[PDB]
């Protein structure tokens, strides 16, 4: 050989129940000090009940299953309200195009933002009715328009031929429509936070709205209409619910503690910065 120079301390465990407590007695000695720690290392304390007090034995059968990320997320929650009025400002044309973005509602958003990256399949349920909750015999069409596919421009656009895009035809009187959606990102996981820009070039203040936008999260358009060449006399409200399933999450982060202002960024109300915890008068009184 002519040139010599050319030649994870963590594993998963199955913990179905909470740790038991072993009985301990008194310890009176030197050299050993479990109560003293050094938080500077970046590690959490390893002290346990038996190190600081005399304990009895407790056979703990308390389950740890409900805190599995799967059971935390697999509960359908509202992610969009699409209205289609008959008279007024909004689309009175009998059709609506909605760009898919699940960051419009707080409850579900705060739960997802607990993690940086998430990969999952989802079950979407479509609850439709009139603005006052009544139901009428109306035929509707829901169509998924992937990025790059022609978006319908009217109630009779050719796009509704849906020869390749997936469509769902259902009556407002039928039960809520429901379908399963796979993990569709071009990347290996969706990311609720993208500290960067989508393209190269200079980033002048005129295009600062690009910051934080990652195409890997842009899944396309969800189009809906009333099936017919004539206008429908009924106002329609579509509530979309998403249920995460077969989920995997990476990198936990601090939970949102300021009200949400916009879908596409973490901006907060600067003049009214809420304190994470409520306050009191003195530090020595409850």
């Amino acid at each position: 050989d002519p040139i010599a120079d050319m030649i994870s301390l963590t594993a998963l465990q199955v913990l179905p129940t909470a740790a038991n407590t072993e009985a301990s007695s008194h310890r009176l000695g030197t050299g050993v000090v479990p109560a003293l720690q050094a938080a500077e290392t970046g590690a959490s304390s390893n002290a346990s009940d038996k190190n600081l007090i005399e304990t009895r034995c407790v056979l703990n059968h308390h389950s740890t299953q409900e805190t599995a990320i799967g059971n935390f997320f697999s509960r359908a929650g509202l992610v969009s309200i699409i209205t289609m009025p008959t008279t007024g400002t909004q689309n009175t044309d009998g059709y609506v195009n909605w760009d898919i973005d699940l960051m419009g509602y707080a409850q579900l958003r705060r739960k997802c933002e607990l993690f940086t990256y998430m990969r999952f399949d989802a079950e979407f349920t479509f609850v439709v009715a009139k603005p006052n909750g009544e139901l009428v015999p109306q035929l509707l069409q829901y169509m998924y328009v992937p990025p790059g596919a022609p978006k319908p421009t009217s109630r009779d656009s050719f796009a509704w031929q849906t020869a390749t895009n997936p469509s769902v035809f259902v009556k407002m009187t039928d039960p809520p429509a429901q379908v399963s959606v796979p993990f569709m990102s071009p990347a290996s996981a969706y990311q609720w936070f993208y500290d960067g820009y989508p393209t190269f070039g200079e980033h002048l203040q005129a295009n600062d709205l690009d910051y934080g936008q990652c195409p890997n999260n842009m899944m396309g358009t969800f189009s809906i209409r009333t099936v017919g060449t004539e206008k429908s006399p009924h106002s329609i409200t579509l509530r979309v619910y998403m249920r995460i399933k077969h989920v995997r999450a990476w990198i936990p982060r601090p939970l949102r503690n300021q009200p949400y202002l916009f879908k596409t960024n973490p901006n907060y109300k600067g003049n009214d910065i809420k304190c994470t915890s409520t306050s009191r008068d003195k530090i020595t009184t409850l």
């Binding site: 994870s8 301390l9 963590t10 050094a38 938080a39 500077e40 290392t41 970046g42 590690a43 940086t116 990256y117 990102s185 990347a187 290996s188 996981a189 969706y190 990311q191 936070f193 993208y194 500290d195 960067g196 820009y197 989508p198 393209t199 190269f200 070039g201 200079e202 980033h203 002048l204 203040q205 600062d208 709205l209 910051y211 934080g212 890997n216 990476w250 990198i251 936990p252 982060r253 601090p254 939970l255 949102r256 503690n257 300021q258 202002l261 916009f262 960024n265 973490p266 901006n267 907060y268 109300k269 600067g270 003049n271 009214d272 910065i273 994470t276």
Partner: protein, 245 residues
């Protein structure tokens, strides 16, 4: 045997006689991208010692009223040494990092700095104060370069999230009575095996004085904080002409 330490990589060596162990972010060491995860087909270039070495960025001055600072990776080095050059000439890049924040005082000074690594550190604005203006951070704030930037609202990390929970991220404390540095080894984290060193910052480094600096009049008042970092397992692909942004 835990307070003393030496970090030697490339043609550089760091020493410290008052450390508090070392943190391996999420328990994983940096590593080159394996063939199962890779997608780009060209043979990567792995410069080794010319880019995986320690680089010392500008020093900051810790004052009794400092808010805190932050830097973004790999932005901080995109224009330094042979690392910067490879980052500019190649479209794709990936690597880990060894972060060593330094700060020494005397046995009479006091104060505690929280040094943390927050991946995908997206910043937010105060929305014009009232919250009716959908303003956005300027390029100079999202990617402050080697000089780093100052936090205006450390309590919410300038992003609507509680600083009190930042310890959920790889971190160390530099508590003056205990240690004079912090060391965190960070592996590559992304949803893709390689990425642009220019358009995307994988994580941000935050140095925040949670416990304000304090000392009696007469004691040295210039207490600097220096940041030294070293890329680890730096790989590059998609060669072409140099591009700064």
């Amino acid at each position: 045997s835990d307070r003393v330490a030496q970090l030697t990589i490339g043609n550089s060596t760091i020493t410290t006689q008052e450390a508090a162990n070392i943190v391996i972010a999420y328990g994983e060491w940096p590593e080159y991208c394996p063939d199962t995860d890779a997608t780009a087909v060209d043979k990567p270039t792995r410069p080794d010692v010319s880019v995986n070495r320690f680089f010392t960025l500008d020093t900051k001055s810790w004052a009794k009223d400092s808010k805190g600072w932050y830097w973004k990776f790999p932005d901080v080095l995109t224009e330094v040494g042979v690392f910067g050059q490879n980052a500019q000439f190649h479209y794709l890049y990936r690597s880990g990092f060894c972060v060593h924040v330094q700060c020494n005082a005397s046995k009479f000074h006091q104060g505690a700095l929280l040094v943390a690594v927050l991946p995908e550190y997206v910043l937010g604005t105060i929305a014009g104060g009232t919250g009716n203006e959908n303003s956005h951070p300027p390029y100079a704030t999202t990617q402050p370069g080697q000089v780093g930037a100052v936090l205006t609202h450390p309590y919410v990390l300038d992003a609507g999230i509680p600083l009190s929970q930042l310890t959920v991220c790889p971190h160390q404390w530099i508590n003056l009575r205990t240690n004079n540095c912090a060391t965190i080894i960070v592996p590559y984290m992304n949803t893709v095996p390689f990425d642009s060193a220019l358009n995307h910052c994988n994580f941000g480094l935050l140095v925040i004085p949670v416990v304000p600096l304090d000392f009696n009049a007469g004691a040295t008042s210039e207490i600097p904080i220096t940041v030294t970092i070293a890329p680890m397992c730096a790989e590059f692909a998609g060669l072409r002409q140099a591009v700064k942004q």
